[PDB]
Design a binder for this molecule. Structure first.
Ligand SMILES: Nc1ncnc2c1ncn2CCCCn1cc(CCCCC[C@@H]2SC[C@@H]3NC(=O)N[C@@H]32)nn1
Ligand SMILES: Nc1ncnc2c1ncn2CCCCn1cc(CCCCC[C@@H]2SC[C@@H]3NC(=O)N[C@@H]32)nn1
Lengths: 322, 322
């Protein structure tokens, strides 16, 4: 109803205390019996609320559904983000962000439970199952030259990687410059884009897709053998809100490093996180394909590649298969 | 009315022939007496239509108002542009373009007779008087690396300059990298922006503002002494449609050169068009200001500057005052 998000927001805000129907009813100026109806419905959606005669209601567990009311709390206490928008289903959080950034300087993010038109690099389809992942776009406003897009993109990778690590029992590695893996399974893809002119960046838009609870059964057969989710490498139920919150904290940590440190300061760290070394790599460059080895990441974040014919290249980006 | 643009489109299309009310009335499936009403109104708006008993109507002159119906003809015959949008008044053709490019690969342009929120570089106010100029944003789709924004921007300048030259009796010069002058008057500003990621440009958006018929009286007093319009340097009435058409042809010529030639091929041409040489220049770089001389434009389009203290800089962009 009209008041669901508001009841939720008050339940979240008052943890680990109970609040009474009465009291929620006075906050929103609505009837006690309307509070009960709203709470009955939150429980049907799979909210876990402890309801005790005489004492009140306590939010114990949120379901796998993003709630604007709750995300409104993540943004209130945030030093980085002016607001967020949350959607059950959208074409793409990246289209939505590129539309929402026009004409303002806000920083914000957009989450959606499903995407019907998720795209990755080179307009590739990005599978965005309802209820099974974090499909997010983040809009930031670094005051910097357009050439710093590539640098942004290196820092945020370690951000994302640390957030996924904290929940997997298995090893989490970056595949430069845009993919994160747990063993041979792709668990996340992200893409950093910018609006800019000669004078500087007007906005960075970082689309980030993280598989959270798909079983292998839930992926499509064309991608199933090289996909995995955080849940398949966690003994405990993975809690999206707990994940989201960890992720926001890392994005913010790496964004500040991004603004303050040269790439040389995180380069060894990135090196030790990467899974592209001592193994043969397939590169696609339009028409051409060619095999190659990753030799080094240089101080400015270019990949140094020795291809199958002994020739050396220095690359700002690539698409690599294994 | 509902059918104005359609009547107009048919009048434009049939030049230099007359078409009869009867015949327009059969094209649109409407009554002869509705055709007369539509034509009476186009004349009130200041269309110049020759109406001859027995023979019909011929469009002689369009007023200083953009008409979707007519611009629909410029796009139909165009090899570059999928469509256009035309507005009597908008916040900014640049905001509109940045919103319209999301989620598609169309190339298009947006014109508006006035802007209420025109912006130039560094969020400066761009005066966009109703009826007195060309306020346009152009969206193109070069398949190229994000670093080619600066190059795009050099080629389009000569495009714009040639289009303004063709109508002024006086000399038209470029002020690198974003301004065109006729004597000491600023007659146009333009700005090239991009949406891009590491893999390439998703879109170029080029905002172009050209003063067409302001009298010096029509500008604001803060800018009046360094502003001019094409009309103040033309003996003949300047015809916006004739201008627009010339401008589209040059944008297209320079866009193809842009796709095909290295900067070195137009560099001398640009040099001879520029007004920044043999004179003292003020540079703004955030906090700092400093005087300097333009020494050369290099083959990659950087300005070589000897500042007042004998130090040399190599600049991709700048804001220069005289
Ligand atoms: N869910 C998946 N898991 C594993 N592999 C997949 C998946 N889907 C398709 N594949 C096959 C592997 C494709 C490999 N791949 C990575 C990438 C970078 C992508 C940016 C992430 C998208 C995020 S989701 C929120 C945002 N909105 C949006 O519209 N996109 C971004 N490009 N290709
Ligand atoms: N009409 C004017 N004529 C002369 N000087 C002016 C004017 N207005 C303000 N000034 C004072 C001089 C400012 C100098 N100056 C140039 C520039 C590049 C600007 C891109 C052009 C804008 C075009 S109009 C269609 C598009 N939509 C949009 O929203 N913007 C673009 N930045 N500052």
């Amino acid at each position: 109803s009209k008041y669901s998000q508001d009841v939720l927001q008050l339940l979240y805000k008052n943890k680990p205390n109970y609040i009474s129907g009465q009291s929620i009813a006075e906050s929103l100026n609505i009837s006690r019996t309307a509070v009960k109806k709203v709470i009955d419905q939150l429980k049907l959606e799979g909210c876990k609320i402890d309801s005790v005669n005489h004492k009140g209601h306590l939010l114990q567990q949120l379901p796998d559904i993003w709630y604007q009311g709750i995300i409104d709390q993540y943004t209130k206490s945030s030093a980085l983000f002016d607001f967020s928008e949350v959607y059950d289903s959208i074409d793409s959080t990246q289209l939505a962000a590129k539309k929402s950034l026009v004409g303002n300087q806000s920083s914000f993010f957009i989450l959606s439970d499903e995407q019907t038109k998720g795209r990755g690099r080179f307009n590739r389809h990005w599978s965005s199952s309802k209820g099974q992942g974090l499909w997010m776009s983040v809009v930031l406003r670094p005051n910097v030259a357009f050439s710093m897009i590539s640098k942004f993109n290196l820092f945020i990778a370690l951000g994302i990687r640390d957030a996924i690590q904290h929940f997997s029992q298995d090893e989490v590695k970056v595949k430069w410059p845009n993919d994160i893996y747990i063993d041979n399974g792709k668990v996340c893809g992200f893409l950093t884009e910018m609006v800019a002119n000669n004078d500087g960046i007007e906005a960075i838009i970082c689309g980030i897709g993280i598989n959270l609870t798909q079983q292998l059964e839930n992926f499509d057969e064309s991608i199933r053998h090289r996909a995995t989710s955080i849940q398949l490498h966690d003994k405990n139920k993975l809690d999206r809100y707990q994940f989201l919150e960890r992720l926001l904290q890392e994005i913010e940590k790496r964004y500040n490093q991004f603004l303050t440190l040269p790439f040389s300061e995180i380069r060894e760290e990135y090196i030790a996180a990467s899974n592209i070394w001592n193994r043969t790599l397939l590169f696609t460059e339009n028409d051409k394909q060619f095999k190659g080895q990753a030799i080094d990441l240089d101080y400015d974040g270019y990949l140094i590649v020795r291809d199958e014919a002994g020739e050396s290249h220095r690359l700002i980006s690539a698409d690599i298969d294994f």
